[PDB]
Design a protein around this motif. Structure first.
Motif, PDB file in Angstrom:
ATOM      1  N   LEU A 127     -11.417 -98.892 -10.303  1.00 60.81           N
ATOM      2  CA  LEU A 127     -12.146 -98.907 -11.391  1.00 60.81           C
ATOM      3  C   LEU A 127     -12.085 -99.100 -13.252  1.00 60.81           C
ATOM      4  CD1 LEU A 127     -15.738 -98.986 -12.535  1.00 60.81           C
ATOM      5  CD2 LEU A 127     -15.219 -96.511 -12.833  1.00 60.81           C
ATOM      6  N   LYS A 128     -10.885 -98.537 -13.435  1.00 63.03           N
ATOM      7  CA  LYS A 128     -10.212 -98.793 -15.132  1.00 63.03           C
ATOM      8  C   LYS A 128      -9.720-100.068 -14.868  1.00 63.03           C
ATOM      9  CE  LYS A 128      -8.280 -95.050 -16.804  1.00 63.03           C
ATOM     10  NZ  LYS A 128      -7.599 -94.127 -16.647  1.00 63.03           N
ATOM     11  N   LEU A 129      -9.554-100.910 -13.772  1.00 62.09           N
ATOM     12  CA  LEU A 129      -8.241-102.320 -13.691  1.00 62.09           C
ATOM     13  C   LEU A 129      -9.750-103.241 -13.374  1.00 62.09           C
ATOM     14  CD1 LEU A 129      -5.441-101.504 -11.786  1.00 62.09           C
ATOM     15  CD2 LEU A 129      -5.580-101.971 -14.264  1.00 62.09           C
ATOM     16  N   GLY A 130     -10.681-102.584 -13.797  1.00 63.47           N
ATOM     17  CA  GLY A 130     -11.875-104.140 -13.864  1.00 63.47           C
ATOM     18  C   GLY A 130     -12.337-104.448 -12.553  1.00 63.47           C
ATOM     19  N   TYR A 131     -11.697-104.037 -11.365  1.00 64.39           N
ATOM     20  CA  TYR A 131     -12.743-104.239 -10.084  1.00 64.39           C
ATOM     21  C   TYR A 131     -14.369-102.896  -9.802  1.00 64.39           C
ATOM     22  CZ  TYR A 131      -8.499-105.679  -8.444  1.00 64.39           C
ATOM     23  OH  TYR A 131      -6.971-106.230  -8.030  1.00 64.39           O
ATOM     24  N   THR A 132     -15.193-103.863  -9.550  1.00 63.99           N
ATOM     25  CA  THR A 132     -16.465-103.589 -10.030  1.00 63.99           C
ATOM     26  C   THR A 132     -17.796-102.843  -9.099  1.00 63.99           C
ATOM     27  OG1 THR A 132     -18.038-105.289 -10.887  1.00 63.99           O
ATOM     28  CG2 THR A 132     -16.891-103.651 -12.761  1.00 63.99           C
ATOM     29  N   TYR A 133     -17.670-103.977  -7.602  1.00 65.00           N
ATOM     30  CA  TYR A 133     -17.853-103.137  -6.553  1.00 65.00           C
ATOM     31  C   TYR A 133     -17.241-102.440  -6.055  1.00 65.00           C
ATOM     32  CZ  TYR A 133     -19.499-104.901  -1.566  1.00 65.00           C
ATOM     33  OH  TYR A 133     -20.052-104.438  -0.417  1.00 65.00           O
ATOM     34  N   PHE A 134     -17.340-101.263  -5.419  1.00 68.16           N
ATOM     35  CA  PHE A 134     -16.679-100.883  -4.488  1.00 68.16           C
ATOM     36  C   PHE A 134     -17.209-100.448  -2.438  1.00 68.16           C
ATOM     37  CE2 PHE A 134     -13.465 -98.953  -6.735  1.00 68.16           C
ATOM     38  CZ  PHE A 134     -13.405 -99.605  -7.376  1.00 68.16           C
ATOM     39  N   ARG A 135     -16.855-100.757  -2.052  1.00 67.96           N
ATOM     40  CA  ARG A 135     -16.869-100.271  -0.217  1.00 67.96           C
ATOM     41  C   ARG A 135     -16.220 -99.737  -0.180  1.00 67.96           C
ATOM     42  NH1 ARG A 135     -19.596-103.230   5.235  1.00 67.96           N
ATOM     43  NH2 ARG A 135     -18.955-104.733   4.209  1.00 67.96           N
ATOM     44  N   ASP A 136     -16.339 -98.624   0.847  1.00 68.93           N
ATOM     45  CA  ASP A 136     -15.540 -96.839   1.705  1.00 68.93           C
ATOM     46  C   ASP A 136     -15.877 -97.591   2.889  1.00 68.93           C
ATOM     47  OD1 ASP A 136     -14.740 -95.001   2.084  1.00 68.93           O
ATOM     48  OD2 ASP A 136     -16.269 -93.071   1.499  1.00 68.93           O
ATOM     49  N   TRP A 137     -14.443 -97.441   3.698  1.00 71.58           N
ATOM     50  CA  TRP A 137     -14.071 -97.876   5.260  1.00 71.58           C
ATOM     51  C   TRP A 137     -13.797 -96.529   5.507  1.00 71.58           C
ATOM     52  CZ3 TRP A 137     -16.083-102.198   7.398  1.00 71.58           C
ATOM     53  CH2 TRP A 137     -16.038-103.426   5.793  1.00 71.58           C
ATOM     54  N   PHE A 138     -14.846 -96.396   6.281  1.00 68.18           N
ATOM     55  CA  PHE A 138     -14.464 -94.710   7.347  1.00 68.18           C
ATOM     56  C   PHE A 138     -14.783 -94.822   8.859  1.00 68.18           C
ATOM     57  CE2 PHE A 138     -18.366 -94.152   4.623  1.00 68.18           C
ATOM     58  CZ  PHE A 138     -19.291 -93.582   5.190  1.00 68.18           C
ATOM     59  N   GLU A 166     -25.687-100.298 -12.086  1.00 68.79           N
ATOM     60  CA  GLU A 166     -26.255 -99.831 -12.537  1.00 68.79           C
ATOM     61  C   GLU A 166     -26.581 -99.664 -11.364  1.00 68.79           C
ATOM     62  OE1 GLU A 166     -29.860-102.788 -12.354  1.00 68.79           O
ATOM     63  OE2 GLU A 166     -31.222-101.349 -12.255  1.00 68.79           O
ATOM     64  N   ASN A 167     -26.104 -99.774 -10.371  1.00 75.44           N
ATOM     65  CA  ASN A 167     -25.534 -98.505  -8.705  1.00 75.44           C
ATOM     66  C   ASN A 167     -24.886 -97.520  -8.947  1.00 75.44           C
ATOM     67  OD1 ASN A 167     -26.067 -98.796  -5.688  1.00 75.44           O
ATOM     68  ND2 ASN A 167     -23.907 -99.048  -6.177  1.00 75.44           N
ATOM     69  N   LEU A 168     -23.925 -98.035  -9.588  1.00 70.42           N
ATOM     70  CA  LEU A 168     -23.193 -96.896  -9.937  1.00 70.42           C
ATOM     71  C   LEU A 168     -23.155 -94.820 -10.549  1.00 70.42           C
ATOM     72  CD1 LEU A 168     -19.836 -95.097  -9.876  1.00 70.42           C
ATOM     73  CD2 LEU A 168     -19.369 -96.617 -11.335  1.00 70.42           C
ATOM     74  N   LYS A 169     -24.036 -96.146 -11.218  1.00 72.32           N
ATOM     75  CA  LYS A 169     -25.298 -94.875 -12.188  1.00 72.32           C
ATOM     76  C   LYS A 169     -26.548 -94.029 -11.232  1.00 72.32           C
ATOM     77  CE  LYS A 169     -26.033 -96.133 -16.717  1.00 72.32           C
ATOM     78  NZ  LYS A 169     -27.085 -97.367 -16.058  1.00 72.32           N
TER      79      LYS A 169
END
Ligand SMILES: [Ca+2]
Ligand SMILES: [Se]
Ligand SMILES: [Se]
Lengths: 197, 189, 198
Positions: A127-138, A166-169
């Protein structure tokens, strides 16, 4: 190609950290056009592998996969300046990243607890490096090896970026409320507070 | 159950205007009926076939088409060597998998929301009697070999009817660009 | 501890598990990608039997699990349904709360699953059921997409009450299956497995 040569130059040069120098041990041809394995080193110990796809543009965007972390070095590597320098380096050549988190116990634990991916120890570094979309694969190892990864991406537009945040919030608001342990809550608060600047 | 029939055709190769297709290696897979056929276009390695010969009340035959040399992409995808190979597999397998990653047209169309059967590669499969389509698009960062079309022959005349009603619906849910006229001309069957 | 467990696994696997089909022995070990992960190659008599992928645990982060896969194709009709298979799972159930068993070469289980029997009352899954495993998943991912996706996944329950609740559910599924099936031979078999469960 322009990308290929600058990945080699940085890596063959070595990346300096207080944990040891990170060096290219060996490069390797992958499945596809533009796909390579870079076996990495930390101070004469094996560190991890980078699976690199350089891009065949409109069709396939570039991505890196960070995996095969040496369990003997998990406690040296995760949360280190070596890891920061690594992700920083890859940040300047890739808009999509996958990092395997299986060896990272803090991120593992936090995800298991319901922490949003972007606000987990590792996710937050991305996130600090600009990546803003996240998916967790488990996915269960057991079924298919290699399925405990965070996938992260830079926003295409100022519009997608706004939507990702907005989704992160929302996700953060849902976590507070579900969370039962004040220490985990404070740590997530403080990552989220960072973002808010 | 017949490799032998598959083997007889494969060495003493396959025709085509782009060079001959021939066998190179051949092994025994994870399961008793599974094998890997390594193939060539000229002297270059082409592609790998993972065949599964069937165990027929329990498991049906399928072939997978993967591991395609990137120096042949623009020559093979589009070609008559592609058609001659499919054509040949269509005679022996009611279920086929093809990795479309190296195929820049199939890729670009799938990504546009084109139905697998009406994509470049999938359309070629539709001609040979494959009627049930699945597009797999799994990030290689997650798992290697998850960019493939799965295509299936109807088990029955009524299964065919149904697959063809789904296709009409996917055709329509798509015209809802300019390559529209490309998909339009493909569906005119 | 991952090490106590490890040492218990070697001891009984290297001593060997006796069956009428032959002695099951550990004949090879290799470190996997994670530290507590190993492949345990097993022979039956003198023939390769299968591979156990063992994950010893890194608690509380990762619970132990064992994956049984890679059954020798020329031993399938010998292994599935044997005393050997039973004694193996029985050993595994003393050490792992979660199990994966590749069912691809087991035609009875394959056949039953395809006809919609609940995974826990299939031939393979019922065998795990009897040993305490209560949560079941039937993976059926095409092999042309990804090798290794025809597995039963099963887990021991955390409490006796969760255990009671998943069993009520198995019952609904069983009665649902039993009124949705022709093949009275299958129904008779699944019914035996279910009557036993009491
Ligand atoms: Ca134990
Ligand atoms: Se054969
Ligand atoms: Se064969």
């Amino acid at each position: 190609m322009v990308k290929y040569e600058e990945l080699l130059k940085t890596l063959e040069n070595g990346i300096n950290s207080e944990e040891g120098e990170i060096r290219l041990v060996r490069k390797s041809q992958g499945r596809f056009k533009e796909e390579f394995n870079f076996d990495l080193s930390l101070g004469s110990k094996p560190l991890l592998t980078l699976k690199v796809f350089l891009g065949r543009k409109p069709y396939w965007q570039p991505w890196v996969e960070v995996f095969g972390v040496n369990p003997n070095l998990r406690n040296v590597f995760f949360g280190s300046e070596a890891e920061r320098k690594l992700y920083e380096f890859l940040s300047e050549h890739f808009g999509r990243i996958f990092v395997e988190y299986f060896e990272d116990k803090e991120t593992t634990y936090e995800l298991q607890k319901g922490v949003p991916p972007a606000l987990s120890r590792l996710g937050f570094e991305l996130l600090k490096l600009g990546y803003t979309y996240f998916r967790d694969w488990f996915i269960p190892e057991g079924l298919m090896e290699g399925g405990h990864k965070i996938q992260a991406e830079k926003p295409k537009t100022e519009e997608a970026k706004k939507r990702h945040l907005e989704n992160l919030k929302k996700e953060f608001e849902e976590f507070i409320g579900k969370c039962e342990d004040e220490g985990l809550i404070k740590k997530v608060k403080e990552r989220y507070n960072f973002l808010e600047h």
